[PDB]
Design a protein around this ligand. Sequence first.
Ligand SMILES: N[C@@H](CCC(=O)O)C(=O)O
Ligand SMILES: N[C@@H](CCC(=O)O)C(=O)O
Lengths: 252, 252
Amino acid sequence: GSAMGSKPLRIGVPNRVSYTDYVSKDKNPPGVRGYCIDVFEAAIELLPYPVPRTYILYGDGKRNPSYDNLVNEVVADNFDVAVGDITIVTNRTRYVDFTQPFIESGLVVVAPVKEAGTIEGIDSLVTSNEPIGVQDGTFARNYLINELNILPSRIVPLKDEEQYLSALQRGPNAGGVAAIVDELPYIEVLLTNSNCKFRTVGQEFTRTGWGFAFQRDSPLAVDMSTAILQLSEEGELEKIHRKWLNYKHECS
Amino acid sequence: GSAMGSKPLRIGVPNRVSYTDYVSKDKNPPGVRGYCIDVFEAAIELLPYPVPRTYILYGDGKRNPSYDNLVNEVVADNFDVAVGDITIVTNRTRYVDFTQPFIESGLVVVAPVKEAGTIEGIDSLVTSNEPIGVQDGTFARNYLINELNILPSRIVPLKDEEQYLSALQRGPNAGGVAAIVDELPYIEVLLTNSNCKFRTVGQEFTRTGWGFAFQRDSPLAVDMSTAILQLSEEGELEKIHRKWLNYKHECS
Ligand SMILES: N[C@@H](CCC(=O)O)C(=O)O
Ligand SMILES: N[C@@H](CCC(=O)O)C(=O)O
């Protein structure tokens, strides 16, 4: 009581193997780095109390982990919060308190410039019956199946940037994919590093955001929402974005 | 107990005198109409329990009411929820539980096409020292003063579409304004009905959204966030948007 001090916050962080500028492991303390970590730390700093905290990596380090499962670790009280590129989707809001979003997100279709005549957006992709690439561990798999009625066998999980590019280059008739469905923040990074061979086709066809996932009725969730809005209004969210993400490439 | 039935939810609704397609009074029940009302009703319908509810108009019907005060009526327990075009801003999240946003929003600068050389965005507007138009009752007044360091005397409240157009047309040297600062959803409607005389200049320089404001720790807020995300993922949010807002005009 008098002798025994406070537990620290147990923060689950996805062990990303792709798009590591958003969030990834660090060899140095605090053991994690990236856009999402700097936003979380900047928001903590704005709180009117200290928040003793430890970061714990979630995932085998081979494939991006299940973000559905990361959030359920918060629900099961194995983490106090999940911090990272965590998409706010219906099934995840049921059991946790997400903050207000700290960045806007939504799904886009990426295809070769050559293929843009036949695959011109999500609707033409649905009807084509050709393979669709997605990241490991994304909500996008169950969104495509349940919302857009895609035959599960069509959805091909891809491990990293090499497999995203490789699958798009090989195409649907040579053990690749007709398109990748992923969130715009990841695709903005992919098109910076893919030499203008690939583009978005059609409209961004979902809209949501990334948020921090706290346990139901967490007072910390409420204050961190206020902090995030403060970061946004002060222009700090854009400053942190500019530090981690430049979207300018050699063919633009 | 056995005889006495449930209170209905007391829903505060802003009595808008401009941009009435977003939310406004109705001569017929339930006494309110608009985009924000249809989103709220569609979200209620998705809940796994009934929500007996009454809508109460907030504002004198002459000027748009203080949205800061509408939210504080929820805090003070005079309303159970505030429903309408309610911007999620730091000072409002302190005491209420906003839903996840049901539409994205942010501030833009509107100026005459002629004036676009001198007023080219928020930064040039700040330094110009000329009058700035805003709606009655908007968060944007205190955002401009506290965040962008605008002398309060420069901020000119305008009553309705007639005064928005009139003030922009008269300009800063004839009892008008150099520009209007307002949220993009309202400006999208203004530029549809202003004959291509006016345009946005520079980047959208804030990002947030509209949400429904529930009392702190409202379980209804949690379920309505899930419902809103469901509406978004099913494409119902866009269907309701298309019913109330068309942005196509005769010079486009
Ligand atoms: N942001 C995605 C995770 C992306 C991935 O699968 O690596 C989600 O929350 O589902
Ligand atoms: N959406 C604005 C209100 C606009 C108005 O002033 O009419 C707010 O929440 O502050």
